[PDB]
Amino acid sequence: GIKNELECVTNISLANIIRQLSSLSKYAEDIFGELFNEAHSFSFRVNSLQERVDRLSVSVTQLDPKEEELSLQDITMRKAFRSSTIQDQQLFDRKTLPIPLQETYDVCEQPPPLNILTPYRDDGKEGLKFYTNPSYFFDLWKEKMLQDTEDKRKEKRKQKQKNLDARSVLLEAIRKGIQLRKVEEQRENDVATILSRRIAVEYS
Amino acid sequence: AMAELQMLLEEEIPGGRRALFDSYTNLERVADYCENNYIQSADKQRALEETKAYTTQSLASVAYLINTLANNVLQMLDIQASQLRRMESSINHISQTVDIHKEKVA
Amino acid sequence: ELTFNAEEYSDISEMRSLSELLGPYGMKFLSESLMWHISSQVAELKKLVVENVDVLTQMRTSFDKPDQMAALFKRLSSVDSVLKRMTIIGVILSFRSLAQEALRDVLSYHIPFLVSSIEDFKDHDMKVAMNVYELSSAAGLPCEIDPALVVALSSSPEEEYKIACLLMVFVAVSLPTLASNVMSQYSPAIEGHCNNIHCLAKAINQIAAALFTIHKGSIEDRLKEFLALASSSLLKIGQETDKTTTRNRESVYLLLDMIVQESPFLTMDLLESCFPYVLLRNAYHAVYK
C-alpha cells in the first residue's frame, strides 16, 4: 500500500541495499572463480609445455648430422605423424550450464512426475517424453536429413536414366606404401557427419 | 616470475575469493540486523543512523574486495601472457635449430 | 587513352616477378623513389597547414564546442588539396605494400634461413630499433614505423612538431567533405572506394608514425587525438539531411573502420567508445546490398 511510514521505508530499502551488496559479493565471487578456473587450467598446460620445450632443447642440441642415418622403414613399418583433429561440438549439453544459471533453473517449476507411470506402459517408452522431449529436435532433423538425402540420390538417377622390380629396394617400400594407404584407409549421430553426408550426395 | 604466480594461484586469489564469499554471508546477517533492529527498537532515529553506517561500510568493503581480486586476476593474466611470449621465442629457436639440422643431413 | 592494363603490371604474380628480377637491392631502390614523391607531397601539405595555422590551433582546443567548430571550418582554405594530397600519399604507400609483400614472399622462398633469422630478430631504444627495421623492410617485412619514410621525411624542433600535430587536425576535420563526392562510393568489387580514399587509412597511419618518430612524440596519443576528432566530425553529418552532403556519408564512415584496422596503435575498443559499431555495420549493409 501507500500508508507505510517514511522512515520505515527508508530503513527497509537500505537493508535491501545491503542484501544487494551481499548478492553482488556472491555474484563477484562466481565471476572471479570461473575466470580463475580457466587460467588455472592453462597453468597446468603452460608448466607441462615448458618442461616439454626444455627437454626438447636438450634432445635437439644432441642431434648429429654426420651420424644420422635415413631409414626406409620410417615409411613402411611406422605410422605417419598426425596432428590433433579434435573438434568441439554439442556445446549446450546440460553439463556445460554454469552454476549460477543451474541454481535459477533448480528453483523453476519441475514437470509433473509422469515417469512414475513408466513401468505401467505397453510400449516400453518413457512417460515424460509424451509431455516434453528435448531430443525431438535432433531426432526429426536427423530423420529429415536422411530422407532428403535419399530423395536427391534418387533424383540424380532419375535424370541420368532419362538422358543416356628387384632392381631398386625403394620401389618395394613405395609399393607397400601404397597398400598401406588403400587397404589401410577405412579401418554416427554427429551433426557435422550428418550434414557432410547430405552435401556429399550433391557431388557424387 | 614463477614465484609471483604461485602466490597468486595458491594463496592470494583463493584468499580474495574466500573474503568475497564471507562478504556474502556476513552482509546477509548485517542486513537482517539493520532491518530487525529498527523494527525492534523504540529509538528509531538511532537505529536508522546505524543502518546508514552499515550501508556505507558495506559499500566500501565490497568495492575494496572486488578491486583487490580484480587487480590480482589482471596480474595473473599479464604473467601468463609474457610466459607464452618467452615460450614462443624458445620454441621458434628450437624449430630453426631442427630446420638447420635437416638441411645439413640433406 | 591508356595504352596498358594496370592489373597486368601490379597484381600479385607481376609484383612477385618484379621482385625476382630486382631483388632486395632493386626493390629497395624502387621504394626510395616512392618515398621521394611522398616527401614532395608532405612538403606541400605543411605549406597548407602553415596557411591555416591560426584556425587549426583554435580547432584543436575547441573540439568540444560545435557552434564555433562549424564556424572555424568555413575559415579553412584548400581542404580539397589536403584530401587529394593525402590520398596520393596513400596510393603510393598502397603500391609499396604490394611491392613489399611480393618481395617478402619471394625471399621467404629463396632465402628461408636468412628470413627466419630476420623474423625472429624483429619480433624480439628508439634509434637502435631503426636499424632492425631497415634490415627487416629490406626483406619485405612490414614494420610499425617505416624506416624509408622516416629517412625521406627527415630531409626549429618545436615548430615542426606543431605543424605535424595540426596536419592531423586538418585531415580529421576534412574527412566529412568526402561524403559529398559521388566517387567516394564504397564498392564491394573494389573492397574500397572509386576515388582511392580507402588508401587514406594507410596514409594517416604511416605519416603519423613517421612524423612523430622524427619529433620523438607519442604516435598512439596523436592518432587517438586524430580518431576522436575524426569520429566527432563524422558523427555531426549523421543528423544532416542534405542529399548533396550526405550522399556517400555511409561509405565515408567506413574509413574509420579501415583506419583502425590498418593502425597498430588504434583498437576497436577505442573506436567503439567514440564511434559505435552499429553505424559501421549499417554502413556495410548499405554498400553490400
Next chain:
Amino acid sequence: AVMLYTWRSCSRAIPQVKCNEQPNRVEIYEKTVEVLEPEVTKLMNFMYFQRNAIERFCGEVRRLCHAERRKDFVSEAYLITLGKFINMFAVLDELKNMKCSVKNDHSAYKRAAQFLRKMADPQSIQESQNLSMFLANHNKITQSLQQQLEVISGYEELLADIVNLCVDYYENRMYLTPSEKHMLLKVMGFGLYLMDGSVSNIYKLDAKKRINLSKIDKYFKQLQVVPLFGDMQIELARYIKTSAHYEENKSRWTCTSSICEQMIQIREDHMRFISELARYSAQKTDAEYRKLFDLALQGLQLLSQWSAHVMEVYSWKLVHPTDKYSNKDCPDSAEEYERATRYNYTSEEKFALVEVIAMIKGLQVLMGRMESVFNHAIRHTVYAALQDFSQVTLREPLRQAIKKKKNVIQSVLQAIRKTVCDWETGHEPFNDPALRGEKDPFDIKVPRRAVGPSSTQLYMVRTMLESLIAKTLRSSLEGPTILDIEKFHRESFFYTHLINFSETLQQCCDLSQLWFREFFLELTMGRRIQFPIEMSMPWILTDHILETKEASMMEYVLYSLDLYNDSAHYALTRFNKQFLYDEIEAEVNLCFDQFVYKLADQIFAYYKVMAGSLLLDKRLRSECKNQGATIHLPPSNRYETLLKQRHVQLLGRSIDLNRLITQRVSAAMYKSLELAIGRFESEDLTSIVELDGLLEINRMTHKLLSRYLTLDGFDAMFREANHNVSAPYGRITLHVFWELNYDFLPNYCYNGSTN
C-alpha cells in the same frame, strides 16, 4: 494465465486402461491420482479466482455507476487498471477455451478418483461437480462477466469512459512499451463487445457521440492483429464482427474487410538518432540534464516502435498462414504452423526482420551503456520540474484561490505542496505575498537534487492535479493556469517509466515471444510434442543468412541467434518452467552445431576462391572476357566480425567462435593438401606442374586465413600431408621416382635440339 498457457497434457503420458480386464488397472488409476491431484488443486484455485475477480470487478463497476457518483471524478490510472481487468478476463477465457489438455486432465483424474472410491466430503463432491461444469463450458468467463455487468444499470457508461480514455491515449501516444500500445487496442475491442448487448447498444451510444466508433475502426484497420498471450494472437476486428448488433450495422466498418517503405524510414531514424546519441556519450546545467532526459525518452520510443514493428508483422503472419495460391512453393499438405511461420516469409522479409532485430539489440546495448548518465539526468530533470512546478508555478493559482473564496481548490493545491515540496530552508516561506493574497513587488531559489519523487508522491500529485482539470473545479480556474497543470500532467506521464529506466529498456526491446508456440502445439491435438527447427522463428531467420551467404547480412547473424537468449530468460523468469528451458537449450545445441558447420564451410570456400582468383593470370581473364566466356569474379563478403568473436554470450555460456571456426578451417586446409598430393599420385610426371600451382593456391589460402585465424605453419601442414614429418622422403618425392621408373625412363624420347 501462465499456468494455463504452459499446461501440457498429463493424460497423454498416462497408459490408458483398454478394458475392465487389465492386470495393472488399479495401479494406473492409483498413480494417475498421485500425479494429477496437485494439478487439479491449481484448477480449483483458478475456478475460485476468476469467480472472485468477476464479482470484485463488477462490485467496483456497481460502486462507480451509482446515480450521483456517476457525476464524480475517477482517476485516469484507475480507469486503465479497470481496462486491464477486462483484458485479463479475455486472456483467461481464451487460454481456457483453447486448452483441451486442462479439461481432459481433470476428467482423467475424475475418472481415476471414482474407480478407486476415495473418501470425499459432500463439500468435495459439489466442488468437483462445479469444476467439471466450469471446464465443460466454452466462453464461461466472458458469459459470467456479461451477466454480472448487464444486471448493473448504466454499466456501459463506465466502460465507455474506459474506452474513450484508451482512444485518447492511443491517438495522443500516451504509451511507451509495445505491450502498453497493444493493451489500449485490446481494451477498446473487448470494451465495445461488452457494451454491445441486450441492455446496451454501441451504435446508439455513437449516435449520441458518447463514443467514437469511426476512430476505433481506423485504428483496427491500421493495426489488425496484436498478441493476446504467447503465440495466441487476437484479431481486433473479431470483437466487432461477433458483437450483438454487428449484422445490421456492417456498413459502419472498414476494418472488417481484407515492408520496403518501412525499412527506408527505420534505417534513417537509426542513422539520425544514434549519430546524436554517440556525441553525448563540477556539475551540468538544467538544459544539459534535460537534453539527456529527452534522448532517453526518444531512444526508448524508437526501440518500442521497432519492436512493435517486428512483433506486429509476426503477429499478423500467425493469423494469416499462407497457402499454394499466395505462395507457389507452399503445399496444401503443409501444416498450419509451418504455413504461419516458415512459408510465410520471402527472402526479403527475412533479411528485413534480422535488420530491425539487430538495430533494436544494438541500440539496446548503447542505451544500457548510458544508463548511469541517464539515471542521474532523469532524476535531476524530474526533481527540477516537480519542485519548480510545486514551489513556484502553483503560487499564482494558489494566490487566486485565497484572494477569492475557493476553499476546495485551496485545500488540494496546498495538499500537493505539502506532499512534494522540498524547501531549501527546510520550511515553507510564510512571508510569501501569494500565500497571503496580494501580488509581487518575490523570488524563490529552488534547490537542485538528483532524486525523483517516490511512486506514492507522484501518484498523489498527478491524481490531485487531475481532479482540478477534470460546477466543476475546472471552471473556477484561470486560462493560463489550466494550461500549466495540463502541461505538467501530460509531461509527468512518462516519469515513472524514465525513473525505472533499466526495466523500461528491456520492455521496449522484448522479442522473447518469437520462439514460444504452446497455442499452436495444443491445436495439433497430441500429434506434435514440439515443432522441428525449420518452423522455429529464430532458426528460420538465422539459417536464411547462412544458406544465402548474404554479405550485407553476415554481420547481423549473431543478433538473430540472440533471440534464444530472450526466450530462455523469459522461460526462466516469467514462465518459470524447466521444460521450456530444456527445449530451448536442446534447440540451441542442435542449431549452433549447424551454425558452426555452415559458417566454417562457407568461410573456407570463400577464402579458397579468393586465393584462386588472386593468382589467376590477368591477361587470360581479359582474353576470356573478349571471347564471351568471362571467368566470373567472386562476390565479396563480410566474415571478419564473425572471425573476431572470442566470447559469444549464449544461454550463459561464453563461446569462442574464432576457436571453433579454426578447428574446421584447419581440417579443410589439411584436406585440400591431401587431395593435391593424392591427385599427383594418380597421374604421370608431367602433372607435377599442376601440383605446384595448386600447392601455391593452398599457400595463398592459408595466408588469407592467417590474417584472422591461428593455424599450424604452412610448411608443417604440408610436411604432414606429404608424410615427411616422421619419414625422410615425402609422398611427392616417392611418386616422382615411381613415375621415373615406370613411365619416364621406358616411355620418353629426348629431343636434344629443343631440350
